[PDB]
Amino acid sequence: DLADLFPGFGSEWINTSSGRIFARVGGDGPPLLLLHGFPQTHVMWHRVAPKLAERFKVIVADLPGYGWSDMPESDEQHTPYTKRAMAKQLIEAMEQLGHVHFALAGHNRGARVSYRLALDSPGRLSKLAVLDILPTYEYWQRMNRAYALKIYHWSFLAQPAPLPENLLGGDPDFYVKAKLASWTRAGDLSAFDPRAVEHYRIAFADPMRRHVMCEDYRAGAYADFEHDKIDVEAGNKIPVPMLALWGASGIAQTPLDVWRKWASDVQGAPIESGHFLPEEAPDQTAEALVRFFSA
């Protein structure tokens, strides 16, 4: 059995037109939605969510298709796993709780859902934080030999099915543990609570969950990139006050200079960390978020 890493938090299974969203819910105050990414689940926030819950009503949700959220059937354009669709789905979920204007922090895929949400539906957000990402358009635009080799999984997981699925199926534990370790500052699993690692491992052990992850990266290579391209070529900037927090040894890395192209009111800082800020640097991440969302 898997551990409860949010002692005292409630658990909700929220219906939407696209399927259920699982969330842990805690605290009180202004509403704050937290969105994980790949290859994780909502439990990645367990080291910062208790502290945030001292100041906010904290909703820690599994992305569409991840963790214990339902997995909609995909299609030829990977539609349910595009960040545009994921953002619509999470907007519906928040409405089910009575939240139509909320604060939002995301990491990895969830940060992409978050800035896409801000571009499509800025009225929904009071403030936005994105953790260790650049826009999907910027990742692809900088593509060259060095980046192709340094950060290969974007193009690998986006290959047509069932190629990535069949490769991942032989020994899935090895792949998910290798990715978790590889993107940390030290390159091992020491930053992670082993109970959290087991949550990630159990999700990754389901071929249906792995297929969703590949669909997510297929969206990332195609429709998500196209959606982004339209905004940057039109000069659309996010007007929601924004924080870009990144790891000095992360994937996104200046990110603030990139984000200033995409957002008219953005602040930012690095933290000494690899990619997984809320687990590698929980006190600093929690502090940065509390201070940003409270101001």
Residues that bind a second copy (CB under 8 A): 140-141, 143-145, 148-149, 152, 154-156, 158-159, 163, 166-171, 174-175, 178, 221, 225
From 81, 25, 128, select the one nearest 227 (Cα to Cα). 81
Q: Tell me the longest C-alpha to C-alpha distance in the chain.
A: 49
68 binds, among Cl ion, a second copy, none (CB under 5 to 8 A by kind): none
Of Cl ion, a second copy, none, which one does residue 28 interact with (CB within 5 to 8 Å by kind)? none
From 115, 139, 204, 246, residue interacting with Cl ion (rule: CB under 5 A): 139
Nearest-approach distance from CB 144 to a second copy, in angstroms: 5
194: three-class secondary structure by DSSP: helix
Instruction: Determine the interface stretch with Cl ion among 66-74, 118-126, 164-172, 248-256 (rule: CB under 5 A).
Output: 248-256
C-beta separation of 272 from 281 below 8 A:
yes
> Which residue, 49 or 216, is less far from Cl ion as judged by CB?
216
Half-sphere exposure for 48 (CA within 13 Å, toward CB): 29
What whole-number distance in Å separates Cα of residue 47 and Cα of residue 40?
Answer: 14
166 binds, among Cl ion, a second copy, none (CB under 5 to 8 A by kind): a second copy
Minimum distance from residue 75 beta carbon to a second copy (Å): 19
Distance CA 219, CA 165 (A): 15
- Order of strands, sheet of 21-27, starting from the edge strand that comes earlier in the sequence: 10-14, 21-27, 57-61, 31-35, 102-107, 125-131, 242-247, 266-271
Stretch that binds Cl ion, among 43-51, 100-108, 115-123, 264-272 (CB under 5 A): 100-108
> Which residue lies nearer to Cl ion by CB, 179 or 201?
179
